[PDB]
């Protein structure tokens, strides 16, 4: 499956793509404002994620740091990134279909649209100004709006017992972005697409 990752932000981002224990394609790359990076993701990838990283520094070897979404200091991510990270999430070729969503379970850093480029399902978008509106207790000094699990480390925010409900903090993300997951047991906003669809993730779509 091909994913075209497009940076429509006025600022440079460093895209990242991983299934948690491995890079997807190169794993990461710089995208200046307006640049497009096409990656190939193996069919049947389960639990894949694409995100943006902000305010990164990398040396010649591809090691450094990002203010948001840092993946162990690597340009070429092989693991998931450090919150806050708006997440484009996908499991492909799962019994004939692909499944896509946007999640704010790990916070929000950059606005995102995640849409098919092929026929047969709709896209999802979280493009509201979540950083600017972020509750004070969730604001990431590094930049971004953390989720409440990251900040407070409770069973209720992290849904550790599988019994949690919505919270004042999850309802903030949900209000700004109804089409993204706001907490682990949120009513799903997952979209069913044709198996072997192709996609585009646009940062700052508006």
Sign of CA dihedral 179, 7, 26, 56: negative
Domain boundaries, the chain: 1-206
Nearest to 82, CA basis, from 65, 69, 63, 67? 69
Q: Note whether 147 and 72 are within 8 A (CB).
A: no
Resolution for this experimental structure (Å): 1.4
The answer for 72, left when phi > 0, alpha when psi is -120 to 50, beta otherwise, is left
Tokens of 169: 């903090």
Nearest to 116, CA basis, from 125, 128, 129? 125
How was it solved? X-ray
Judge residue 64's burial from the number of C-beta atoms within 10 Å of its C-beta, 0-12 exposed, 13-18 middle, 19 or more buried: middle
From residue 53, how far is each of 13, 49, 70, 83, 85 by CA, in Å? 6, 13, 7, 10, 8
Give the architecture (CATH level 2) of 1-206: Sandwich (2.60)
């Amino acid at each position: 499956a091909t994913f075209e990752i497009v940076n429509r932000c006025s600022y440079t981002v460093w895209a990242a793509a991983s299934k948690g224990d491995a890079a997807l394609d190169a794993g990461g790359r710089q995208l200046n404002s307006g640049e497009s990076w096409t990656i190939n993701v193996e069919p049947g990838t389960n639990g894949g994620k694409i995100w943006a990283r902000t305010d990164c520094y990398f040396d010649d070897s591809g090691s450094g740091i990002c203010k948001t979404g840092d993946c162990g200091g690597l340009l070429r991510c092989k693991r998931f990134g450090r919150p806050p990270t708006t997440l484009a999430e996908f499991s492909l070729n799962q019994y004939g279909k692909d499944y896509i969503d946007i999640s704010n379970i790990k916070g929000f850093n950059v606005p995102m649209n995640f849409s098919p480029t092929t026929r047969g399902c709709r896209g999802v978008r979280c493009a509201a100004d979540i950083v600017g509106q972020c509750p004070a207790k969730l604001k990431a000094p590094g930049g971004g709006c953390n989720d409440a699990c990251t900040v407070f480390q409770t069973s209720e925010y992290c849904c550790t017992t599988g019994k949690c409900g919505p919270t004042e903090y999850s309802r903030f993300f949900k209000r700004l972005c109804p089409d993204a997951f706001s907490y682990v047991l949120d009513k799903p906003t997952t979209v069913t697409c044709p198996g072997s669809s192709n996609y585009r993730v646009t940062f700052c779509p508006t």
